């Protein structure tokens, strides 16, 4: 049931992802060193991680079939609002349920609840973020469904500030239909049961997580002393 165009879209997104996600995590040595002792001792390190991660999400977004056809302004709005959501999604790849931490190669680059706490966040975000990681992980998505979900997340018509929502909605739909059809043909039962409905629900959880993250980000970014520890990109995208 998978058309030629849809098998093409999946080939594009898989490649786009592989070029923007290094599973060896070699670049992490460039980030400011993580400090585990110390209020906000992990902020400089994770700030750089996110800033790096924003760049990679942009690189992935540009390769989403149809994304280029949008105006630069709509491109900006979609990325600016989806960025944290897509980073939370793509982070699932390093998240292990063996201890509820993001394991990126080494112990120094293994991050858990307390590390995020020392980044300036409360449990009001961290618990549901882990809950999300656990719930997403238990879906055991095919990498094909993983990359489709991130693209569908990026191209959401309902983002505040979008102009040509019609075009955005036509890009996303073509992606939804590619995902739905893929689940039917390539994902065998029972793991395919309600699979699409459960994936869309994750986009709902991400909206809530985004809303909560922004709230806490503004509180942290309010003190110029903390705002200093961030990067110019993170400031530009997450707001000033």
């Amino acid at each position: 049931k998978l058309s030629e165009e849809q098998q093409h879209i999946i080939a594009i997104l898989l490649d786009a992802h592989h070029k923007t996600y290094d599973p060896t995590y070699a670049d992490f040595r460039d980030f400011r060193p993580p400090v585990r002792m110390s209020p906000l001792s992990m902020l400089p390190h994770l700030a750089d991680l996110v800033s790096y991660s924003i760049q990679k999400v942009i690189g992935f977004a540009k390769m989403i079939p149809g994304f280029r056809d949008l105006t630069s302004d709509d491109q900006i709005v979609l990325l600016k609002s989806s960025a944290i959501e897509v980073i939370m999604l793509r982070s699932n790849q390093s998240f292990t349920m063996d201890d509820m931490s993001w394991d990126c190669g080494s112990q120094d680059y293994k991050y858990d609840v307390t590390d995020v706490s020392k980044a300036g966040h409360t449990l009001e975000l961290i618990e549901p973020l882990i809950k999300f990681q656990v719930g997403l992980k238990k879906l055991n998505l095919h990498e094909e469904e993983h990359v489709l979900l991130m693209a569908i997340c990026i191209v959401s018509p309902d983002r505040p500030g979008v102009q040509d929502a019609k075009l955005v909605e036509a890009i996303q739909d073509r992606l939804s239909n590619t995902l739905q059809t893929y689940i039917r043909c390539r994902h065998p039962p029972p793991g395919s049961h309600q699979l699409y409905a459960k994936m869309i629900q994750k986009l709902a959880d991400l909206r809530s997580l985004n809303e909560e993250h922004s709230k806490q980000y503004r509180s942290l970014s309010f003190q110029p002393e903390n705002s200093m520890k961030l990067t110019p990109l993170v400031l530009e995208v997450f707001g000033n």
Partner: peptide
């Protein structure tokens, strides 16, 4: 608007 760097990364 006001996004120099994000605009540049989008080529």
């Amino acid at each position: 608007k006001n996004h120099p760097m994000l605009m540049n990364l989008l080529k």
